[PDB]
Design a protein around this ligand. Sequence first.
Ligand SMILES: Cc1cc2nc3c(=O)[nH]c(=O)nc-3n(C[C@H](O)[C@H](O)[C@H](O)COP(=O)(O)OP(=O)(O)OC[C@H]3O[C@@H](n4cnc5c(N)ncnc54)[C@H](O)[C@@H]3O)c2cc1C
Ligand SMILES: Cc1cc2nc3c(=O)[nH]c(=O)nc-3n(C[C@H](O)[C@H](O)[C@H](O)COP(=O)(O)OP(=O)(O)OC[C@H]3O[C@@H](n4cnc5c(N)ncnc54)[C@H](O)[C@@H]3O)c2cc1C
Ligand SMILES: O=C(O)CC[C@@H](O)C(=O)O
Ligand SMILES: O=C(O)CC[C@@H](O)C(=O)O
Ligand SMILES: [Zn+2]
Ligand SMILES: [Zn+2]
Lengths: 467, 466
Amino acid sequence: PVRRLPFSTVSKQDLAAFERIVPGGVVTDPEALQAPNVDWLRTLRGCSKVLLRPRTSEEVSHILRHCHERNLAVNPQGGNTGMVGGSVPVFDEIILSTARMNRVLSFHSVSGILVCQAGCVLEELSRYVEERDFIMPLDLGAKGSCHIGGNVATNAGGLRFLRYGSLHGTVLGLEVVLADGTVLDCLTSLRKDNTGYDLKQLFIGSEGTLGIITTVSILCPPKPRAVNVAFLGCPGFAEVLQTFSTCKGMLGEILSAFEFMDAVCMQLVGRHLHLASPVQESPFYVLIETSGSNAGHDAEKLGHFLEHALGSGLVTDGTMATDQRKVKMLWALRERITEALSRDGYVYKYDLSLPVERLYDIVTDLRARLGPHAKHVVGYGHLGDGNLHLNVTAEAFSPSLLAALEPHVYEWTAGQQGSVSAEHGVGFRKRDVLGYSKPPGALQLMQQLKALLDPKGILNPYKTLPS
Amino acid sequence: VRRLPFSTVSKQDLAAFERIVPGGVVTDPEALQAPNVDWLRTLRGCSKVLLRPRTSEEVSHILRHCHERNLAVNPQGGNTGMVGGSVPVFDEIILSTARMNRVLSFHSVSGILVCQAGCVLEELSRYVEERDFIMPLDLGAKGSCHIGGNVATNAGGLRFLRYGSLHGTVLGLEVVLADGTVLDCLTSLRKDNTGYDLKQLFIGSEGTLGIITTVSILCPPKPRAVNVAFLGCPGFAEVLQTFSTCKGMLGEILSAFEFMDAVCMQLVGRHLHLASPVQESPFYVLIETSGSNAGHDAEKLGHFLEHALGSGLVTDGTMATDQRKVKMLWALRERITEALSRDGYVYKYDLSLPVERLYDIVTDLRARLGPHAKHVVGYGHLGDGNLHLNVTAEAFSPSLLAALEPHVYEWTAGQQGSVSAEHGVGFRKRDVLGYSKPPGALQLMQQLKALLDPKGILNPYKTLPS
Ligand SMILES: Cc1cc2nc3c(=O)[nH]c(=O)nc-3n(C[C@H](O)[C@H](O)[C@H](O)COP(=O)(O)OP(=O)(O)OC[C@H]3O[C@@H](n4cnc5c(N)ncnc54)[C@H](O)[C@@H]3O)c2cc1C
Ligand SMILES: Cc1cc2nc3c(=O)[nH]c(=O)nc-3n(C[C@H](O)[C@H](O)[C@H](O)COP(=O)(O)OP(=O)(O)OC[C@H]3O[C@@H](n4cnc5c(N)ncnc54)[C@H](O)[C@@H]3O)c2cc1C
Ligand SMILES: O=C(O)CC[C@@H](O)C(=O)O
Ligand SMILES: O=C(O)CC[C@@H](O)C(=O)O
Ligand SMILES: [Zn+2]
Ligand SMILES: [Zn+2]
């Protein structure tokens, strides 16, 4: 397995130092450390003996100062919803939680610029800005637990990426505490600013290996006057692809989401979450969201789109909603697939960028390659962005199934010049499969960046660069 | 200010470059005159060698040689940059991307364009528009600027309000590092979270961390309907309320919101012989929309104009959808900087400020300089909080400079603003970044420069503080 690097260990003197630095924010009880030591998938468990819960940036600076002097490894943690083992310790790394860094600093009701602490929960920020007629530029099924700082650190994609784009575009600024405790102020709450290198970009998607994000400045789109959702059954993946093409051609700028899922996804959400399907049974389903300023115009656009889709046989059955309750019910069928999967058994999870025309090939292939050894195989996800969520469920983990899946899936993906981690990132699980998507020289430059910014390697060791 | 201890180009270096780039070694002093002078004609180098590589490998071998020989290199694109970054200070070798102008691929479904860094922006716009796509950025310099220079400077421009930053729209880069190492981050994927987003370091790095040789970029679909409204507003309060109403009533179809004052209109009319299409007003607003249903857009515009004219925010306005008149109206805005450079010496500031006080500095400067300036103008990308502030004089005055600087930068800092929103830093602004950046940021910038280019051969005297 992996070998523990020669870090120090937490002493009683370290515990007293942390008690000084963050009064009331030191958790040492072994039973309390159980939950923060286990990842969301429940397949990785750390042995951390101390949880720190600072409230302020200065406390994070001082914690890291101490850990730097003492050579203590630190595991940053947000909502602990990450999918790649990046969020929990491997050995006895200190868990530094942002749970209590949950304050909004300011919100400007004209520019739409939000500034908040890294540990603000995404759904709560959404409620906050929606009260002021804005929205968050990203959303995901983990919204109820994930922290904005986690989202920035993982460069989270999500359900409205197609409309508002990457955090690399929507993050306006960051405050980041470096491994030695230096507070890096890149908190430029300005729409535009070309005064030197865009240092904050290094910390977007770096998963806590280059520094700990403590404050975020983010551009919030205006809240749309009109939101529509359509949920459609398609008789094959070719019709899904043509439905996408037609959807872009007829809805255009009002399109805010395009998600697909297969029949098995629908069956699992129905069986485990008791969610009835609102359309006729089909081998594929598509959820489309639109967001716009004029309800009448959006309705005309959608009506004509539906007319054409049903006319040319791209869609066999479809339903539409504007009522918030019904919209949420329809969205639940897509958002909760991952939960139903984790309720179905042990989950093998792959998050791939592929040519959209070939997005589903791997699922049919794996259904053939695997047999009754797979309990289920599913494909779903962000088709508009070329992003497939591939999942295999089984009664239990088995080495034989892992050996059938890997490296086969990663070589198929490399054969398509795809990404073996479209959005979930690298972390612990994928640290040794980056060669399928990144050339050696890039990986080396990444290693040099790590050495420059964290020469002691105390920030999230065993991740997210190759060994 | 003072020349760093770089080597000097010998006859053997010339013979090596002739081996590396046959046909691409320019040493004629008269041919070297134009590439040594920046667009503003206020900086002029003494470079004696211009290199014009064709391929990425030629660039790699050139930089390998310069690394072994400790020769400074000045990358140059279209040479339209505004901050003295694009021309040597002394005798840096000018490496031009002029011949690196081929498109490599374009995926007719994803809209992803892969092209060499020296492709001119206008030409790329033509290419992708022939295929029903558009570039995610546009600039007044479109006719000359290179996509490599746009990425190196993180160019903003006239459709930034709709499509946003190159940090979002650039999908991949091939970069040649100072020692010749070719860094391949030339992915063509919409989403790829397999490690650090290294390409981001080179977007806005102004050639100090590496030479961009290949760009992969996401082109938005070409709009079915483009509309432009050119409106006259009786004051800046009404400009700001017009902006708010525009966002409320046009929404997602909005693709541009630009403003200019009366003096800008007078200067473009005088020097460029472009007549105003609207009544004389203290302020003018150019609104562009882009949409998929021309009728819905036209209806939105109708209701917007009716409301704006009815509530007194706009006094008189003209709209255009014909491509020719659209380009005429856009020309009234795009060529202001040229009319200014024909009015005499130009003091140029590019500031990010709170939109609600975007114009306050123009009024302040007009009171502060009164008759010692020829003109003070404010215009630009109001939707993005970005003011272009220009002062013209019949000739340069150290007096007027002392009146403008540091005052303007201090004012900006007082607004927690940016002293260079878009155009960047280059040579001109290397020592005024402290008004927008704290010392720890600038130090980390210097550490990255030292990691990527320890000899400092790439673009010396830029773009970090002295
Ligand atoms: C139901 C569900 C749906 C999801 N949907 C999506 C989706 O649509 N798109 C998508 O991209 N992902 C999705 N995810 C996974 C996604 O990575 C997480 O939901 C989220 O982005 C991470 O937030 P977090 O606070 O839980 O981070 P954590 O899991 O706590 O940590 C993530 C990583 O970043 C580091 N980190 C955390 N906080 C900080 C910080 N403040 N500073 C520095 N480093 C830090 C951690 O060390 C770790 O390596 C989903 C997950 C679930 C469970
Ligand atoms: C009329 C006019 C209008 C303009 N409008 C705008 C506007 O709306 N928005 C805006 O942001 N800017 C605008 N600009 C200025 C803008 O910075 C440049 O026009 C544009 O960004 C491209 O510059 P360029 O291709 O000429 O690069 P150059 O001027 O040749 O170079 C600019 C800088 O980038 C570096 N560089 C160039 N090519 C490369 C390369 N391949 N690799 C690495 N480094 C490189 C150079 O060393 C230099 O430091 C305008 C300029 C003019 C003259
Ligand atoms: O669990 C998964 O594979 C996908 C989860 C998440 O990224 C989603 O978009 O639903
Ligand atoms: O020269 C200027 O002040 C601004 C130039 C350019 O960014 C423009 O938008 O006109
Ligand atoms: Zn996802
Ligand atoms: Zn500009």
